[PDB]
From a paper:
The N-terminal domains of p85α include an SH3 domain, capable of binding to proline-rich sequences, and a BH (breakpoint cluster region homology) domain. The BH domain can bind to and regulate several GTPases including [name], Rac1 and Cdc42. The p85α BH domain also exhibits [name] GAP activity to stimulate [name]-mediated GTP hydrolysis required to inactivate [name]-mediated protein trafficking functions.
To determine if the patient-derived p85α BH domain mutations impacted the overall folded structure of the BH domain, several of these BH domain mutants were crystalized and their structures were determined using X-ray crystallography. X-ray diffraction data collection and structure refinement statistics for bovine p85α (105–319) mutants (E137K, [name], R262T, E297K) are provided in Supplementary Table S1. Three BH domain mutants, I177N, [name] and E297K, all showed significantly increased [name]-GAP activity, whereas the E137K mutant had reduced activity. These mutation sites are located in regions of the p85α BH domain, well away from the [name] binding pocket. Further, crystal structure determinations for several of these mutant BH domains indicated that no major structural alterations were present.
Residue numbers in the entry:
A (entry chain A): 113 to 167, 172 to 298
B (entry chain B): 113 to 167, 172 to 276, 281 to 297
The structure:
Amino acid sequence: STLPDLAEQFAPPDVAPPLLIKLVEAIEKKGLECSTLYRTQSSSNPAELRQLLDCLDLEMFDVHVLADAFKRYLLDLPNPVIPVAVSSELISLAPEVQSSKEYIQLLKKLIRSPSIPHQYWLTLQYLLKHFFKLSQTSSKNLLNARVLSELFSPLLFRFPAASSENTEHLIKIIEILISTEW
Amino acid sequence: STLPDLAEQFAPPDVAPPLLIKLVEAIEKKGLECSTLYRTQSSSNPAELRQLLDCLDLEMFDVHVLADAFKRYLLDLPNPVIPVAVSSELISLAPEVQSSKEYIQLLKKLIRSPSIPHQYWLTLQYLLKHFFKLSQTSSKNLLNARVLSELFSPLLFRFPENTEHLIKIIEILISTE
């Protein structure tokens, strides 16, 4: 709620918001192999999780609390990682655009727009790297790229779209972008 | 024009773009008393000035070249220091509103909007501080708040009448730092 805009939390040459780096690195250190990471709610409520996003070393916290604070962070951003301007255009695309490659091309073109601060695309890239690292230990944490897209796309886009052939394409491109990080 | 957006050049807790700080500090060191600062075209063209804004110590350069690079910087920003939405609103209120105090209150309210990165208002504050510093030696450089407003308002707002109210806001904001 008091969480600043992504464009105010950091700037190049930094690669991601410092708070998001702390969360991701703590979660990867403690939960990379956790078979229920991001699929179980912790006991803390939103108010408690937000208190965490202000005050210590995050490794001190329960990994399930960190995972919930990670979700809380994405939800409390004034504008989502993928701005509504971008999602609005992607959803509007006709069925003749059957190509995931085209959807990806358009997301990158739109999100790299000069009207959108570079921090948004940088934050998405950092998150995709995190999701990819998780999917490379799928044999233990059970997370593949598609499930990660289905779990986190509603947090990255923050769009109540009514579910359609368009929404399947957005989930699909996030899936593809996770799997194709390196 | 590869110049990044103001919001991409720095972020809190930094108070202004690092390149703009270097320009301002060099100009104030070398040209605080120059009777023609910011009113003389130097021999350099935009390409040469951009060469300078794209990368060592700026004090090595002719002060009139630094002044031109300062202007070039404001012109090459992808979005102006005062965003188009803000200027548009202030301009459309031009016939109906007259109070300078109201315009100033509104400029601050609009530019502090959550939809606008804080860097824009921070950069404007830094620029106003520079312009005020110049006006304290106006007897020597001839740059008073009014002259500074007429020179730089078109660069801050990015407008080639209605503007007269905008220029007045910058003048007052320079004078009251």
